[PDB]
């Protein structure tokens, strides 16, 4: 499909697939995201789903493998560097009841 | 003839001789050919003397008697001079057509043709199938009946030579062509059927592939927005869009068309409701709602179009995916002597070239086992290119026959051209090539040189470069040339070769190949030779031209940025030759070619006359103005002027060395080059 | 890792064909042992045995080494290459070192700095005796790019002839006409190009000014036999 | 023998080269690459020239 | 600028028009000229306002009032107004353009459209009003000089050399000789018949001076009519004496060093009030007040960033 369209399409399809199982939930895609981008995404979903559960799906096929130091990779704004994101920080922003 | 000329006293004499020549040696090719062509000039002398005197009652009735005395001999002579070549008879065969189409409506000329067409071998006509099918629908009945009957019999032996051009005619917009063309296919069905129906499908599917719906809507809405928002032509704007709405009213025939109709199609149909409300109300508030919907899809399409780097057949045309072991042969491979290299199967992916027009890169597997790559162009008429390649074929024959040329291996690199409609067609992909613009770009990024360096130097010196007077421009232009070493191509030809004994051979080929197309291009009138339109063979070193739209000096006459140049011979091309310069191989090859063309000028004229006077292709000449038969004579007079060395001053007659000297000055002149459009790159 | 190399560079006490060939083999194999890239170092053991292996990796071995060397060592090396080209010409040993010099031009490491001119003049003369006339030509044109002279043009003409390319050689004579005039054009140049008509005209102009010189008499007679003017030639 | 081989080139007659033309990678490797890829590639090509039937019997 | 007896404007590609002083060499005031270059300056005989022919506009700035923009900006012409003449009465203004049409413009009236037109074949490179104020000589790119009469419309076409663009042509104030110049670098002089009243005006060919090797650009006689300055792309402004047509002086702006590819061409030139000096603009950004007899740079005016193609010079009391 060419690079850009494919990424939106995969995001669209992935949403549909999940909607077979849970059709009544706010889905919010992050597509080749930054770190700030993930922070604003997760912190918003915890605000809304106050004490009820939030799903965090991470698909890291295009980025290097997660490190021994408890890190998961995302991008920088320009898509020129793989930025690491701490699992600690990731579980800060996401709340308690989560999957 | 050389002493006297052509006139009232010489024609009866020179015919008296040539008739005798013919008597004394019946079998001899030239004795008949000379007789025929002399008679044929005795026609055009008396036709052009009638238009010179009579136009500028009894004279047209005398002209019937007068020309028919020289027309029937000419035909009978050309028919015998075809049967005595049997191999190299293109000149002779085209002249027969020119006679037939113009004068064949006469009873006596018609008889001569009927008797001739019987005697002659059917293999001869395969040369001129293009020229025949162009006149498939001639309004004159007695002419057109004999064309049909001839094409029919070309169908019964060598149907592979006919299906492609007939199938293009069969889906023609004009009524008479498609009637005539279909009637001939109906005859071909009971010979083949499977072949006809295979070709009928393949061509329909290839056209569908060549321009998708979202590509058509993009070009249509760009054109429709310019008519409405620019010119305020509302009725003409509907002519652009109403076929596109009616186009989709077939429905989704393939998955790509489904997914278009899925995403956008609902809105387009809704926007048509506002347009159809405007036709019976006449409101500004109605029609602005439609352009809101059109610009919604237009922006969404424009965002998509760069992402279509490749098209899969499963989506775009599944009919073609299914195709196995077709009897219908690979386009532009058919030869009546060789065994048919029939289509095994079409490859599933289409590598879309990222250009303005977005051509595909189609590839077919042959029954011989070899892949054949093509370039499937959409919305760019290829009938010119088809004719121009017919000319290069002729010229290659002439260079092969001359020993001087043959010893040097002079020839024009040509490729297959297969039209599929008025818009689209296949071009044969030449391997191991890349455009001169591409080469220089890639060299300059490697060597860290700014790509627009010559341009940047000019605009620094004089930021109003475009608006400067001629002399002002020449100063600025020269300042750029003196302050940039224009050796990029010379340097990269060295770097890109393995040994130096190979390098040397590549460079020899390069120089000669260039010279051949400089001269051939000059005669043809071929303009628009910017560095994207010529490409260099990365093994042989030979040059190759592409894009033959601007022929017969059309780009010299155009209003904004008229070319003042016979051919591209700018300082990068020159530096890539031997360091001594133009005056070695290039200038000498230029002589050798221009000697061959000047000798065989009737052969070159015969071909060029054929595709100037073709009424399907004449539209290119009239369009420069802001009736046609007047303009068409001027073109062909000029071609004779060039081929006779009466092209700089009609008073003088230059020999080849003198003519080639003035041409090289004209191409090399800074005054001429600085006036060129900047995209032409007058400094490479 | 440059003690054994410096013996293989600075020996050059070789007075035969097989002696210089021995200098090559010791030079090539010493480059393999040294080479930093292990893909080349791994072929050393093979190359000791099979020698056409060593010839095939010569240029690649050389470049790997030659980038690592320290300026004074590059000069130490080049002086020995000059000695091999200059002193004692063998068809194998020269055409190895020309193919090294050509390979070095295509690289981004830049050409071998031989003898001040990148050895353009040295390598041209050597390529001419190897009968590698296209290499000879390339170098003789580089010469011409820097500064055209008459003596360059002459050699340029004969190289083109030897290389079967008389129309390119004719172009060299056209260049001479424009940029140098007429005095620089010898009669012999017409003779080389088989311009026997114009060569005779030149030798007539020369024999009027100058006195009875043996060279100019035979030069004019040589034109007459080529023309076939047996009458004038017998006079 | 050398004398006959000339005497037979004589009798068949000085054929013209143009009638005779009808009658009849290592630098390329470097032409493309950077040097760190280049060295394996040229080593392999040279090894696989050997690695075909004849000289391998010992090597 | 206006009140000072001498005027010396200068202009080129940098979008300015700088008014210098001949006695000092100091820039009094600049004036903006956006949208184009300037192809030809011209002070009016009345000296009230300068002219500046450019691309699709003849602009005319005030000489008297200090630091405004243009007064009378004409338009309505396509492709480069190459020249401007001026009628001594101060009513009429002539032009020549790349659109192959000479024109006449009424200054005293409002008509933005030109009054009369004399269309030709090829682009017009130069205009020159004959001192009698009745004939307008017009050169062009095809080679054709013309003499469009301003009362009878009788154009007397003339081609000195076939297929060479005549780039400039001038006729001295006393109507003795007429000079023309072409892109080869020759300087064809023509001797005039004394036909003011009768309008005989017959041009008698005198001498083809082999003036320059490269493109010649402008020629102009002095007010004395003793000297004929001839400028060119070969970086020299030669001065030929009118009697002999032999090289008196040669004003050159070369490097004095073979390692220097194209410093700049010598464009305009303009004699002083008494033919003692000669001003000269060049593409090296510098105007230069030379001395005629000696051949010495008396002054130099160094203001412009980009090149300098025009001059205007006026010592009219
Ligand atoms: N006969 C051919 N063989 C191989 N490649 C070709 C051939 N013709 C064109 N090409 C390549 O395909 C590219 C695009 O084709 P082409 O230039 O004919 O059309 P375009 O650029 O889409 O339209 P236009 O040039 O008219 O703007 C060219 O830049 C060239 O590299
Ligand atoms: Mg193109
Ligand atoms: Mg095109």
From Swiss-Prot, chain A:
Coiled-coil intervals, chain numbering: none
Modified residues (Phosphoserine): 30
Described function: Component of the mechanistic target of rapamycin complex 1 (mTORC1), an evolutionarily conserved central nutrient sensor that stimulates anabolic reactions and macromolecule biosynthesis to promote cellular biomass generation and growth. In response to nutrients, growth factors or amino acids, mTORC1 is recruited to the lysosome membrane and promotes protein, lipid and nucleotide synthesis by phosphorylating several substrates, such as ribosomal protein S6 kinase (RPS6KB1 and RPS6KB2) and EIF4EBP1 (4E-BP1).
Signal peptide coordinates: none
Organism: Homo sapiens
TM regions (residue ranges): none
Family (UniProt): Belongs to the WD repeat RAPTOR family.
Domain of life of the native organism: Eukaryota
Compartments in which it is found: Lysosome membrane; Cytoplasm; Cytoplasmic granule
Subunit structure: Part of the mechanistic target of rapamycin complex 1 (mTORC1) which contains MTOR, MLST8 and RPTOR. mTORC1 associates with AKT1S1/PRAS40, which inhibits its activity. mTORC1 associates with DEPTOR, which regulates its activity. mTORC1 binds to and is inhibited by FKBP12-rapamycin. Forms a complex with MTOR under both leucine-rich and -poor conditions. Interacts with (via TOS motifs) EIF4EBP1 and RPS6KB1; interaction is independent of its association with MTOR. (Microbial infection) Interacts with vaccinia virus protein F17; this interaction dysregulates mTOR.
Name of protein: Regulatory-associated protein of mTOR
From Swiss-Prot, chain C:
Effect of residue 199 to S: In FCORD2; uncertain significance; somatic mutation
Expression across tissues: Expressed in numerous tissues, with highest levels in testis.
Residue ranges of coiled coil: none
Chain positions found as Phosphoserine: 1
Domain of life the protein comes from: Eukaryota
Consequence of substituting residue 190 to D: In FCORD2; somatic mutation
Subcellular location: Lysosome membrane; Endoplasmic reticulum membrane; Golgi apparatus membrane; Cell membrane
Outcome after substituting residue 196 to G: In FCORD2; somatic mutation
HEAT repeat residues: 14-51, 52-85
Post-translational note: Autophosphorylates when part of mTORC1 or mTORC2. Phosphorylation in the kinase domain modulates the interactions of MTOR with RPTOR and AKT1S1/PRAS40 and leads to increased intrinsic mTORC1 kinase activity.
TPR repeats: 86-122, 123-148, 149-182, 183-213, 214-235
Subunit-level organization: Part of the mechanistic target of rapamycin complex 1 (mTORC1) which contains MTOR, MLST8 and RPTOR. The mTORC1 complex is a 1 Md obligate dimer of two stoichiometric heterotetramers with overall dimensions of 290 A x 210 A x 135 A. It has a rhomboid shape and a central cavity, the dimeric interfaces are formed by interlocking interactions between the two MTOR and the two RPTOR subunits.
Protein family according to the UniProt entry: Belongs to the PI3/PI4-kinase family.
Disorder: Smith-Kingsmore syndrome: An autosomal dominant syndrome characterized by intellectual disability, macrocephaly, seizures, umbilical hernia, and facial dysmorphic features.
Record-given protein name: Serine/threonine-protein kinase mTOR
Lineage: Eukaryota, Metazoa, Chordata, Craniata, Vertebrata
Gene name as annotated: MTOR
Location of this fragment in the whole protein: 1261 to 1495 of 2549
UniProtKB/Swiss-Prot annotation, chain D:
Tissue-by-tissue expression: Expressed in numerous tissues, with highest levels in testis.
Record localization: Lysosome membrane; Endoplasmic reticulum membrane; Golgi apparatus membrane; Cell membrane
Intrachain disulfide bonds: none
Similarity section: Belongs to the PI3/PI4-kinase family.
Subunit structure, as described in the record: Part of the mechanistic target of rapamycin complex 1 (mTORC1) which contains MTOR, MLST8 and RPTOR. The mTORC1 complex is a 1 Md obligate dimer of two stoichiometric heterotetramers with overall dimensions of 290 A x 210 A x 135 A. It has a rhomboid shape and a central cavity, the dimeric interfaces are formed by interlocking interactions between the two MTOR and the two RPTOR subunits.
Function: Serine/threonine protein kinase which is a central regulator of cellular metabolism, growth and survival in response to hormones, growth factors, nutrients, energy and stress signals. MTOR directly or indirectly regulates the phosphorylation of at least 800 proteins. Functions as part of 2 structurally and functionally distinct signaling complexes mTORC1 and mTORC2 (mTOR complex 1 and 2).
Record protein name field: Serine/threonine-protein kinase mTOR
Organism: Homo sapiens
Residue window of the full protein shown: 880 to 967 of 2549
Swiss-Prot record, chain E:
Taxonomy, superkingdom: Eukaryota
Pfam families named in the record: WD40
Cellular localization per UniProt: Lysosome membrane; Cytoplasm
Cysteine pairings via disulfide bonds: none
Cross-link (Glycyl lysine isopeptide (Lys-Gly) (interchain with G-Cter in SUMO1)): 306
A GO molecular function held by the record: protein-macromolecule adaptor activity
Residues with PTM Phosphothreonine: 44
Impact after mutating residue 48 to A: Does not affect ubiquitination by the SCF(FBXW7) complex
Signal peptide: none
Tissues in which the UniProt entry reports expression: Broadly expressed, with highest levels in skeletal muscle, heart and kidney.
PTMs per UniProt: Phosphorylation at Thr-44 by CDK1 promotes ubiquitination by the SCF(FBXW7) complex, followed by degradation.
Record family assignment: Belongs to the WD repeat LST8 family.
Xref: PANTHER family: G BETA-LIKE PROTEIN GBL (PTHR19842), TARGET OF RAPAMYCIN COMPLEX SUBUNIT LST8 (PTHR19842:SF0)
UniProt protein name: Target of rapamycin complex subunit LST8
């Amino acid at each position: 499909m060419g690079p850009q369209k494919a990424l939106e399409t995969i995001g669209a399809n992935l949403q549909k697939q999940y909607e077979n199982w849970q059709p009544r939930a706010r889905y919010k895609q992050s597509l080749d995201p930054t770190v700030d981008e993930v922070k604003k995404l997760c912190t918003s979903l915890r605000r809304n789903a106050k004490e009820e559960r939030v799903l965090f799906h991470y698909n890291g096929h295009g980025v290097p493998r997660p490190t021994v130091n408890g890190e998961v990779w995302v991008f920088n704004k320009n898509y020129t560097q793989y930025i690491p994101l701490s699992i600690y920080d990731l579980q800060t922003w996401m709340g308690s009841p989560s999957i | 003839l050389n002493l006297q000329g052509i006139n009232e006293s010489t024609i009866p004499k020179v015919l008296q001789y040539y008739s005798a020549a013919t008597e004394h040696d019946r079998s001899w090719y030239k004795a008949w050919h000379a007789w025929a062509v002399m008679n044929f000039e005795a026609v055009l002398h008396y036709k052009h003397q009638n238009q010179a005197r009579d136009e500028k009652k009894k004279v047209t009735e005398d002209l019937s008697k007068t020309l028919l005395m020289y027309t029937v001999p000419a035909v009978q002579g050309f028919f015998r001079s075809i049967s005595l070549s049997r191999g190299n008879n293109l000149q002779d065969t085209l002249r027969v057509l020119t006679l037939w189409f113009d004068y064949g409506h006469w009873p006596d000329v018609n008889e001569a043709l009927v008797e001739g067409v019987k005697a002659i071998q059917i293999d001869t006509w395969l040369q001129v199938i293009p020229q025949l099918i162009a006149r498939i629908d001639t309004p004159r009945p007695l002419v057109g009946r004999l064309i049909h009957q001839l094409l029919t019999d070309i169908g019964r032996y060598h149907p592979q030579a006919l299906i492609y051009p007939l199938t293009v005619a069969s889906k023609s917009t004009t009524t008479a062509r498609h009637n005539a063309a279909n009637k001939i296919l109906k005859n071909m069905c009971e010979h083949s059927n499977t072949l006809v129906q295979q070709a009928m499908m393949v061509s329909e599917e290839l056209i569908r592939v060549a321009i998708l719906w979202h590509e058509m809507w993009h070009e249509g809405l760009e054109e429709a927005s310019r008519l409405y928002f620019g010119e305020r032509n509302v009725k003409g704007m509907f002519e652009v869009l109403e076929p596109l709405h009616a186009m989709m009213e077939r429905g989704p025939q393939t998955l790509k068309e489904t997914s278009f109709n899925q995403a956008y199609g609902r809105d387009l149909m809704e926007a048509q409701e506002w347009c159809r409300k405007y036709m019976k109300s006449g409101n500004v508030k109605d029609l602005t709602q439609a352009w809101d919907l059109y610009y919604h899809v237009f922006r969404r399409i424009s965002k998509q179009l760069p992402q279509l780097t490749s098209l899969e057949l499963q989506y775009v045309s599944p009919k073609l995916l299914m195709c196995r072991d077709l009897e219908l042969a690979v386009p532009g491979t058919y030869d009546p002597n060789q065994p048919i290299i029939r289509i095994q199967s079409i490859a599933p992916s289409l590598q879309v070239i990222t250009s303005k027009q977005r051509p595909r890169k189609l590839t077919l597997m042959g029954s011989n086992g070899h892949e054949f790559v093509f370039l499937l162009k959409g919305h760019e008429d290829l009938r010119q290119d088809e004719r121009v390649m017919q000319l290069f074929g002729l010229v290659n024959t002439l260079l092969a026959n001359d020993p001087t040329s043959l010893r040097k291996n002079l020839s024009i690199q040509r490729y297959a051209v297969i039209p599929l409609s008025t818009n689209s067609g296949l071009i044969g992909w030449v391997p191991h090539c890349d455009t001169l613009h591409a080469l220089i770009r890639d060299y300059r990024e490697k060597k860290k040189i700014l790509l627009n360096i010559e341009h940047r130097i000019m605009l620094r010196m004089a930021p109003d470069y475009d608006h400067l007077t001629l002399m002002q421009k020449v100063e600025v232009f020269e300042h750029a040339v003196n302050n940039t070493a224009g050796d990029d191509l010379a340097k990269l030809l060295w770097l890109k070769s393995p040994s130096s004994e190979v390098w040397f051979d590549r460079r020899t080929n390069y120089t000669r190949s260039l010279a051949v197309m400089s001269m051939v291009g000059y005669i043809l009138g071929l303009g628009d030779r910017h560095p994207s339109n010529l490409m260099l063979d990365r093994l042989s070193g030979k040059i190759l031209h592409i894009d033959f739209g601007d022929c017969f000096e059309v780009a010299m006459t155009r209003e904004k940025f008229p070319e003042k140049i016979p051919f591209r011979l700018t300082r990068m091309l020159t530096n890539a030759m031997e360091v001594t310069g133009l005056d070695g191989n290039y200038r000498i090859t230029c002589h050798t070619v221009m000697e061959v063309l000047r000798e065989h000028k009737d052969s070159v004229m015969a071909v060029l006359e054929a595709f100037v006077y073709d009424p399907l292709l004449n539209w290119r000449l009239m369009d420069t103005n802001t009736a046609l038969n007047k303009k068409a004579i001027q073109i062909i007079n000029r071609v004779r002027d060039k081929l006779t060395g009466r092209d700089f001053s009609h008073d003088d007659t230059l020999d080849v060395p003198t003519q080639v000297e003035l041409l090289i000055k004209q191409a090399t002149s800074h005054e001429n080059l600085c006036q060129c459009y900047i995209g032409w790159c007058p400094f490479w | 890792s440059t003690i054994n190399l410096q013996k293989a560079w600075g020996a050059a006490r070789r007075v035969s064909k097989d002696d210089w060939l021995e200098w090559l083999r010791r030079l090539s194999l010493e480059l393999l042992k040294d080479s930093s890239s292990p893909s080349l170092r791994s072929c050393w053991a093979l190359a000791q045995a099979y020698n056409p292996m060593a010839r095939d990796l010569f240029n690649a071995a050389f470049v790997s080494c030659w980038s690592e060397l320290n300026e004074d060592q590059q000069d130490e090396l080049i002086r020995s290459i000059e000695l091999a080209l200059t002193s004692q010409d063998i068809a194998e040993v020269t055409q190895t070192l020309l193919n090294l010099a050509e390979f070095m031009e295509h690289s981004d490491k830049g050409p071998l700095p031989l003898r001040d001119d990148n050895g353009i003049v040295l390598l041209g003369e050597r390529a001419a005796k190897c009968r590698a006339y296209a290499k000879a030509l390339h170098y003789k044109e580089l010469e011409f790019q820097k500064g055209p002279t008459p003596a360059i043009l002459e050699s340029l003409i004969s190289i083109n002839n030897k290389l079967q390319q008389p129309e390119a050689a004719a172009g060299v004579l056209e260049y001479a006409m424009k940029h140098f005039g007429e005095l620089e054009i010898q009669a012999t140049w017409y003779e080389k190009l088989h311009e026997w008509e114009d060569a005779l005209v030149a030798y007539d102009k020369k024999m009027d000014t100058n006195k009875d010189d043996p060279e100019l008499m035979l030069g004019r007679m040589r034109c007459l036999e080529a023309l076939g003017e047996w009458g004038q030639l017998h006079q | 023998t050398r004398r006959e081989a000339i005497r037979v080139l004589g009798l068949l007659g000085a054929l013209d080269p143009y009638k005779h033309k009808v009658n009849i990678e290592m630098l390329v490797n470097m032409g493309n690459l950077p040097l760190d890829e280049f060295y394996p590639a040229v080593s392999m090509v040279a090894l696989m020239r050997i690695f075909r039937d004849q000289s391998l019997s010992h090597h | 600028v206006g009140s000072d007896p001498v005027i010396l404007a200068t202009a080129g590609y940098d979008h300015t028009v700088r008014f210098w002083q001949a006695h000092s060499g100091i820039c009094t005031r600049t004036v903006q000229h956006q949208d184009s270059q300037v192809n030809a300056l011209e002070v009016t005989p009345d000296r009230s306002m300068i002219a500046a022919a450019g691309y699709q506009h003849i602009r005319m700035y005030d000489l008297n009032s200090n630091n405004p923009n243009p007064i009378i900006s004409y338009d309505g012409v396509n492709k480069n107004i190459a020249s401007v003449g001026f009628h001594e009465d101060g009513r009429w203004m002539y032009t020549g353009g790349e659109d192959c049409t000479a024109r006449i413009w009424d200054l005293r009236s409002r008509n933005l459209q030109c009054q009369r037109i004399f269309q030709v074949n090829a682009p017009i490179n130069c205009v020159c009003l004959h001192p009698n104020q009745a004939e307008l000589i017009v050169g062009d790119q095809s080679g054709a000089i013309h003499i469009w009469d301003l009362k009878t419309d009788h154009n007397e076409q003339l081609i000195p050399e076939p297929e060479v663009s005549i780039t400039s042509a001038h006729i001295d104030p006393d109507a003795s000789y007429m000079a023309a110049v072409n892109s080869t670098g020759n300087c064809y002089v023509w001797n005039l018949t004394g036909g003011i009243g009768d309008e005989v005006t017959q041009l008698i060919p005198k001498t083809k001076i082999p003036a320059h090797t490269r493109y010649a650009l402008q020629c102009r006689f002095s007010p004395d009519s003793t000297l004929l300055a001839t400028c060119s792309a070969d970086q020299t402004c030669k001065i030929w004496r009118t009697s002999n047509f032999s090289l008196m002086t040669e004003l050159s702006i070369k490097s004095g060093n073979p390692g220097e590819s194209s410093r700049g061409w010598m464009w305009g030139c303009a004699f002083s009030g008494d033919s003692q000096y000669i001003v000269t603009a060049s593409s090296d950004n510098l105007a230069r007040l030379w001395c005629v007899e000696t051949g010495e740079i008396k002054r130099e005016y160094g203001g412009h960033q980009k090149a300098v193609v025009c001059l205007a010079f006026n010592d009219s009391v």
